[PDB]
Paper text:
We also solved the crystal structure of a C-terminal fragment of [name], mLANA(124–260), at a resolution of 2.14 Å, where a detailed structure was obtained for residues 130–260. It also is a native dimer, and the fold is very well conserved with kLANA. However, the structured CTDs of kLANA and mLANA share 28% sequence identity and the root-mean square deviation (r.m.s.d.) of the peptide backbone is only 2.2 Å. Between the two LANAs, the regions of highest structural conservation contain the entire β-barrel and the helices α2 and α3. Also mLANA CTD was observed to self-associate laterally where the dimers were arranged as linear chains. In kLANA, the interface is mostly hydrophobic, whereas it has a more hydrophilic character in mLANA. The angles between two neighboring [name] dimers range from 0° for mLANA, 72° for the kLANA pentameric rings to 90° for the kLANA tetrameric ring. Opposite to the DNA binding site, both kLANA and mLANA CTD contain a characteristic lysine-rich positively charged surface patch, which appears to be a unique feature of γ2-herpesviral [name] proteins. We have previously shown that residues 228–231 (KKLK), which are located on the basic surface of mLANA, influence the interactions with [name] and BRD4, and affect mLANA-mediated transcriptional activation. Likewise, the mLANA 4A mutant was incapable of establishing latency in the spleens of infected mice.
The KSHV latency-associated nuclear antigen (kLANA) and the MHV68 mLANA ([name]) protein are required for latent viral replication and persistence. We solved the X-ray crystal structure of the C-terminal DNA binding domains (CTD) of kLANA and [name]-68 mLANA. The C-terminal domain (CTD) of [name] forms dimers, which bind two adjacent DNA sequences, the [name] binding sites (LBS1 & LBS2) in a single TR. Importantly, kLANA and mLANA CTD dimers undergo higher order oligomerization.
Residue numbers in the entry:
A (entry chain C): 130 to 260
B (entry chain D): 130 to 208, 212 to 260
The structure:
Amino acid sequence: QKPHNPSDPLPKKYQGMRRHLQVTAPRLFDPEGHPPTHFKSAVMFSSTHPYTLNKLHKCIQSKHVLSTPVSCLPLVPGTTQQCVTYYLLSFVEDKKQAKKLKRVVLAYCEKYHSSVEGTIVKAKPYFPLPE
Amino acid sequence: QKPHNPSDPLPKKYQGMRRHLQVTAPRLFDPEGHPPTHFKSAVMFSSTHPYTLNKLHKCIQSKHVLSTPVSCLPLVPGTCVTYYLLSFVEDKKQAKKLKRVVLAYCEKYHSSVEGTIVKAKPYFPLPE
């Protein structure tokens, strides 16, 4: 896979969520300023739906929040009673931003993408994002 | 992006590292014992070399350690792709163990590979 290119315009379908995120969390989606020096935190967004996280991958992108493309979690051996769970990581500066991003994204998703779950994640000393 | 199949055999070229992991950290790579109830921790292994991570994706697999397939990290605005996988483990103790062991091997044979300790608050959304 290859990472998202910010310059690419959003499809119309995704514009609703993006606009909502810009209004609700304007500091995390402010097109101005410099990205944070370190991304010590992230929210893992997960869903059993294979395509719902595509929307999140495209919408949850700015200078202050960087999202991986959609991948999938590993299977728990050797259960057959399970399904594939898909996920992405939305990297942010600190836990404070992560809690905020989770809350805001889930609030939107609880109504329209209810299978989406969020998990606050933390790295030490921070995440190895290419510089 | 399809998850690792534990029922599938390992290609010969990966068997070496798997054997090394089995011998070095037997408690993480042994079929015996009880798998973790929660996976609270992970090691993210990252590298600009995707084929190397494909090796780690297949080799770093057991009932006690669960690695995602290889994906990639986003670019940091204001700039080559960096790839990653997550290896999920039980707690930070296992994560430190896994990181030291994998990086000891990679230090000589795959020097591009980096490891970062990752902690989920409160756990990773893996099934019970």
